[PDB]
A paper describes a structure:
Human 3-phosphoglycerate dehydrogenase ([name]) is responsible for the NAD+-dependent conversion of 3-phosphoglycerate (3-PG) to phosphohydroxypyruvate (PHP), which is the first step in the de novo serine synthesis pathway. Thus, [name] activity diverts glycolytic flux into biomass production. Limited proteolysis with thermolysin revealed a stable fragment of [name] consisting of the core of the catalytic domain containing the cofactor-binding site, and this was shown to crystallise readily. Thus [name]-93 provides a valuable tool to investigate binders to the cofactor-binding site.
[name]-93 was then successfully crystallised with an empty, accessible cofactor-binding pocket. Soaking of all 15 fragments into [name]-93 crystals was performed overnight at RT using a fragment concentration of 80 mM in 20 % DMSO. All of the fragments for which crystallographic data were obtained bound to the adenine-pocket suggesting this pocket to be a preferential site for fragment binding. Analysis of the fragments’ binding modes showed that four of the fragments (5, 14, 15 and 16) were coordinated by hydrogen and/or halogen bonds, whereas the other three fragments (3, 9 and 10) appeared to be stabilised only by apolar contacts. Of the four compounds forming specific interactions with the protein, fragments 5 (3-chloro-4-fluorobenzamide), 14 (5-fluoro-2-methylbenzoic acid) and 15 (N-(3-chloro-4-methoxyphenyl)acetamide) constitute substituted benzene rings. The most potent compound according to the ITC data, fragment 5, bound more deeply in the adenine binding pocket compared to the other two structurally similar fragments, and formed an halogen bond with the backbone carbonyl of Gly151 through its chloro atom and a hydrogen bond with the side-chain of Ser211. Fragment 15 formed a similar halogen bond interaction with Gly151 through a chloro-substituent. Fragment 14 was substantially less potent (Kd = 26 ± 31 mM) compared to the two structurally similar fragments 5 and 15 (5, Kd = 1.6 ± 0.2 mM and 15, Kd = 2.8 ± 1.6 mM).
Numbering used by the authors:
A (entry chain A), B (entry chain B): 100 to 294
Write the structure that this text describes.
């Protein structure tokens, strides 16, 4: 709420970092390397962002990313399609979302209906090379399915602020070259903290 | 031109990385650490961004960062205040800009008049803790001055896509904990490349 904009801003940051591989490029530089061809990027303008959860944080993510020329589509079981239209998000059924997205970001609570929302089945419905963000709750994205998608190239990269266990005991995801991550920094701004 | 958006998008990524230290957090995580207090961030909303150079790239930066609630001010000796007003940037004299800015980004050519535009003299006029981006041309920001400002804390962080020498022979800046960097990735998208 107070921290809605902090979360939204981190999520936008992560989307940009996935598009241009800034964290990996920084590490490359700090290891004394100059690897231009290796970190060839993607432009956000004209790409489709899928937003799962169209509450406050999801809406703020949407309007920011609209300024980059992203097409914003999304899903929410409560919010009406005419309401979401009013902040620029085209609502569709979940099955329609997967195959259109170049980027997917999650903004839901952790519920039975949202645990493993992204899983082996839904990654198989995505465009090859999809990039995924989770700055919401650990477990919305099934961690084993994500790892398998990254290993096959079905998923070209992921950004994670949250994990099923924190700090994460399993290291496979964190350690993957196409994964960027933070130690649950979503609310961690001076402004969010000091009301 | 074709690559204007690619550059503007990298710039905005770098601003978000400075605000939340995403590259440093990723490196922390990959080294098996979980360092939440270390990577306490700043919210962009309400902060002032100074844009030096209000051509196509600077303007695209401005409208993206306006969506985050940044106040956008800037300087350009050639663009008229009425043109810049049309994309939401308050033009001011250079001497007025420095003290106001939480973030400064440069979007000029490399000319005698822009070489060391940010130097010991102009860092001294900045707000303590200013964060600086250069995704334009190596040398606009004086590299020794930038290093001195980082070491004193006058500058809280810097994002560099470009360097006076490429790759940079001097390593002090790259190696600093508060410097994020890329090997000149501004135009390196599939879209900029493949017209
Ligand atoms: C299955 O997807 C969902 C389930 C629940 C919510 N939101 C709340 C507050 O319950 C959002 C989504 Cl997208
Ligand atoms: C004194 O600073 C400048 C000098 C020149 C330019 N731009 C061009 C196109 O010449 C911009 C600045 Cl900010």
């Amino acid at each position: 709420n107070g921290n809605s904009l902090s979360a939204a801003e981190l999520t936008c940051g992560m989307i940009m970092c996935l598009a241009r591989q800034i964290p990996q490029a920084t590490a490359s530089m700090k290891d004394g390397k100059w690897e231009r061809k290796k970190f060839m990027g993607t432009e956000l303008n004209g790409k489709t962002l899928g937003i799962l959860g169209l509450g406050r944080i999801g809406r703020e993510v949407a309007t920011r990313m609209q300024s980059f020329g992203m097409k914003t589509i999304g899903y929410d079981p409560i919010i009406s399609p005419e309401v979401s239209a009013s902040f620029g998000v085209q609502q569709l059924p979940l099955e329609e979302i997967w195959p259109l997205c170049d980027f997917i970001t999650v903004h839901t609570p952790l519920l039975p209906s949202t645990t493993g929302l992204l899983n082996d089945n839904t990654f198989a419905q995505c465009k090859k090379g999809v990039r995924v963000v989770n700055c919401a709750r650990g477990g919305i994205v099934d961690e084993g399915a994500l790892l398998r998608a990254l290993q096959s190239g079905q998923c070209a990269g992921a950004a994670l602020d949250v994990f099923t266990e924190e700090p994460p005991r399993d290291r496979a995801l964190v350690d993957h070259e196409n994964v960027i991550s933070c130690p649950h920094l979503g609310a961690s701004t001076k402004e969010a903290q000091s009301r």
